[PDB]
Amino acid sequence: MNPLIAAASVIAAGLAVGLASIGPGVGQGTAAGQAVEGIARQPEAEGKIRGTLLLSLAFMEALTIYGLVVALALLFANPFV
Amino acid sequence: MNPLIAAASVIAAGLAVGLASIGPGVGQGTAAGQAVEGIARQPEAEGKIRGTLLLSLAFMEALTIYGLVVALALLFANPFV
Amino acid sequence: MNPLIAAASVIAAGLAVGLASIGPGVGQGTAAGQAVEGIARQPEAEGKIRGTLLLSLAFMEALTIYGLVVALALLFANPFV
Amino acid sequence: MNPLIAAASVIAAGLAVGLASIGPGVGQGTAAGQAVEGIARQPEAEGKIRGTLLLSLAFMEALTIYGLVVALALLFANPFV
Amino acid sequence: MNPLIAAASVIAAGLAVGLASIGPGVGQGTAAGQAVEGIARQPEAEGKIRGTLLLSLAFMEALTIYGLVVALALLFANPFV
Amino acid sequence: MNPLIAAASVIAAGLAVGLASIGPGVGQGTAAGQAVEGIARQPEAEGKIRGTLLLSLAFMEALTIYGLVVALALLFANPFV
Amino acid sequence: MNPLIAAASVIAAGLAVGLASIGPGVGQGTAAGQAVEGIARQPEAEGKIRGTLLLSLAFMEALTIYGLVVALALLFANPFV
Amino acid sequence: MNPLIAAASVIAAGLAVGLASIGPGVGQGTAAGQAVEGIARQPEAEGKIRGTLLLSLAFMEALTIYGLVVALALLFANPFV
Amino acid sequence: MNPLIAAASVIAAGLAVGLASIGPGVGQGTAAGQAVEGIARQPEAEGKIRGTLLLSLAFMEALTIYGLVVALALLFANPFV
Amino acid sequence: MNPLIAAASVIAAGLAVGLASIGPGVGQGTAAGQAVEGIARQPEAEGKIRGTLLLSLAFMEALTIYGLVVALALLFANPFV
Amino acid sequence: MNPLIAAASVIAAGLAVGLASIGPGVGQGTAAGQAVEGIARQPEAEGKIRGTLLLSLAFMEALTIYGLVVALALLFANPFV
Amino acid sequence: MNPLIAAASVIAAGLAVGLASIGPGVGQGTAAGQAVEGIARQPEAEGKIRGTLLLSLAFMEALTIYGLVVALALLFANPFV
Amino acid sequence: MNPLIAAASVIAAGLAVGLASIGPGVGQGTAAGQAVEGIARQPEAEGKIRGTLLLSLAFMEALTIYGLVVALALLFANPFV
Amino acid sequence: MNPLIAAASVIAAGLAVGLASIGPGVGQGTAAGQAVEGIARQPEAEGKIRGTLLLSLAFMEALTIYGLVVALALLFANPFV
């Protein structure tokens, strides 16, 4: 009853943060890999490449942070428990 | 009964935000990777490349935000609890 | 009974929006990646490339929006609860 | 009992629209990606390429719409509830 | 009892239409992608390419339509409910 | 009891037609893709290519039709209900 | 009891025919794809290519037919019901 | 009890034949694909290529037949029912 | 109770033979594919290629036969039923 | 009751840290691999390459650390137990 | 009770031998494929290639045999039944 | 009750350490593979390559160690049992 | 009770040895394949190649042996039964 | 009670060691494969290549050993049984 909501909440938190890193994890690697390959091919373009990569890493990091925010909400701002 | 709806809601929220980052995570990486590869090959085209990438990252970020919106609705604007 | 329908509805909503971004997420990345690669190779064709990409991103975004619409219907226009 | 049909219906709706975007999502991206690559290689063929792509996107969009139609039928034209 | 058949039927309908688009979704994208690549390489062959593609898209669309037909039968021509 | 057979039958039908399109879906796309690529490379061989493709599409379509036949048998020629 | 065997039988039939097309579906596509690619490269070898392909398609079709045979046996020659 | 053995047996039969075609399905396609590619490249070697392919197809077909044999044994030579 | 051992045994048999063909199926195809590609490239080496392939097919066939042996033992030499 | 929340919490912790390393694990490898490939091709660019890689590894490491933080919170800062 | 151990044992045996062939199956194919490719490219190196392949096939076969040994132990040398 | 927390804890520990090696396992291999390829291509760059690889291996090893730490905490610093 | 521990132990043993061969199976194949490819390209390097391969096969074999050791411990050195 | 903890512990041990070899198995193969390819291309660099590979194999072996350590702890240093 009262325990079920809390039990469901902690499971939801684990799933939220756990699953949220799978896509962005693979994606950040793909971006970063082509970035350093680009720098090796065109060292003078490091600034342009690093700038575009950082922008990209931020967009992908945000995806996982949405998962963290929900997990933290389920633990420390839970409106049902 | 009353606990089951809340329990289901928090699980649904975790799933919504967790699953929603898998595709866009991989996708943003693919786009970002070819972007920095393009910049390395054609540094003078950085502006055009960064512009088209940012447009693409926004479309893909939105996919995951739909998941976040539903999760936030299930937690803080729940119509059944 | 009455709780089961609501419980099923919130789970369905989470699944609907969560699953709906997997394909379009990967797809938008593939399209966007080849778009910026194309711009790097042929900067003069940016307009034609961006036009075709935007059309494609819209078709793929719609796929996930169908998921969002059903999720929002299950939460805020539920005909069974 | 009476709630089981409605509960099954909302789950079915979520699955129908959620799963239906996975294939067409990936597919539309593949098509759109080769389309913009083609335009970059042969800008004079934009019309032919855009025409064939649009035809293809429609065929793939329909696949997911079948899922949406069933989901909407399960929610708003349910013959068992 | 009477509810179980209806409950099973709506789940079956969702699965039928949902799963049926995964393969044809990916397939149509592969075909369409090589079609527009072919048009870019050989614009004079557009007619032959579009003809063969359309034939292929129809064969693949049919695969998913079999799923839709069964789903519609389970909802609106159910012989057990 | 009596409802279980009908309930199992509709689930079996959904699975049969749903799963049966996954392989042939991907396969038809692979075949069709190389077909249009071949036509672009060798337009004079369209007839030979279209002939072999049609034969191949039929073999792959049959795979999914076996699924449809079983589904239709489970719904409209069920020997247990 | 008596219903359980029939219920298990129809599920088994659906699984048998459904799963049996996944491998052969992908396989037939791979074979057919390289066949039409071969015809495009070497049109004079169409006969040899089509002959070897047909042999291959038969071997792969048989794999799925084993699934159909078991499904038909479970439905119409069931030794337990 | 008595029904459980028969129920388990039919499920086992479906799984046995269903799963047994996944690997050999993909494998036969890989072999057949490289065979027709080889014939296109070296038409004079058709006999040698077809001979080695047929040997390979037999070894892979046998893998799935082991599944069929067990399924047929579970249905028509069951020592427990 | 008493039926549980027999019920578990038939399920185990189905799983044993079903799963055992997945790896060797894919593997035999990979080996056979490169074998016929090798024969096309170097027809004079057919004997050496066929010899090494046959050795390899035997090692891979054995993997699945271990599954068949256990399945046959569970059905016809069961020490617990 | 009191045990269920603790039981759910430890499971959630395991899932959180376990799942959170899958994506970043693959991603860090992709980035690091292209980094050392880049250094081999352009040894003079080691500094630029190492700098961009380290930035990327930090972004990807953070993804998994979010999982660790939630796990540690569930164990040692649990607000429900 | 007494039946549960035997029931668990036969399931364990099926899983042990079934799962144990997946990796080695794919692996042996990869090794054998590059072996025959090598022989085609360098027929004079057949002896060296066959020797290294046989060593490799033995190491991979052993992986699956560990599964067979445990399965046979669970059936015919079970210390708990 | 008291056993459930301990039972959940040991399962969580197994999952934590088991799952945590999947990503970093694949990743470390990718990095190490390109490292030795780089050394072969540019032996004079061994030091730079080994330095960047070691940094990368540490970042990836840490991912799995987070899993080990949680597992060890669940076993030997469990705050709920 | 007493049967549950033994039942869990035999399942654990099957899983341990079954799952433990998946990675090392694929890995040994990758290593062995590049080894024989290397020998074909550089027959004079057979000794160096075979030596490094054997070292690698041992490291990968050990991974699966850890699984066998645990399985054998669960069967023949079980501390709970 | 006492049996549940022991039962959970042996399952956890099997999962821990079983799953822990999947990633490192694939990874070690990737590294070892490129190592022997490198030796074939640059036999004079064997020492440098073998050194970097061994370092890498150790890092990857450790990943699986963490799984073995937890499994051994669950069996022979269990703090709950």
Author numbering:
A (entry chain H), B (entry chain I), C (entry chain J), D (entry chain K), E (entry chain L), F (entry chain M), ...: 1 to 81
Quote the study that presented this structure, word for word.
ATP synthases convert energy of H+ electrochemical gradient across the membrane into energy of chemical bonds in ATP molecules by coupling of H+ transfer and ATP synthesis. All ATP synthases consist of two main parts, FO and F1. The most advanced are the studies of the c-ring which is a key part of the rotor. The proton flow passing between the ring and a-subunit2,8 drives rotation of the c-ring.
We present the first high-resolution structure of the c14-ring of cF1FO from spinach solved to 2.3 Å resolution. The space group of the crystals was determined to be I121, with the cell lattice parameters of a = 93.14 Å, b = 96.34 Å, с = 158.68 Å, α = γ = 90° and β = 106.72°. The c14-ring asymmetric unit cell contains one ring with 14 c-subunits in each. It shows a network of hydrogen bonds between water molecules and amino acids showing intersubunit contacts that determine the angle between c1 subunits and therefore the number of subunits in the c-ring. Glu61 side chain is directly hydrogen bonded to the Tyr66’ side chain and to the oxygen of Phe59 of the neighbor c-subunit. In opposite, interactions of inner helices create an extended hydrogen bonding network in the region close to the stroma inside the c14-ring, where double conformations of Gln34 side chains of neighbor subunits are connected both directly and via water molecule Wat203. Thr30 side chain and Val26 oxygen are hydrogen bonded via water molecule Wat202, additionally stabilizing the region. Ser21 side chain is bonded to the backbone of neighbor c-subunit via water molecule Wat201. The additional electron densities form three circles parallel to membrane plane at different levels with the distance of about 5.4 Å between each circle, which corresponds to the average distance between the bulky hydrophobic amino acids of the internal α-helix of the c-subunit. We hypothesize that the densities originate from isoprenoid molecules (presumably quinone isoprenoids, such as coenzyme Q in mitochondria, plastoquinone in chloroplasts and menaquinone in bacteria).
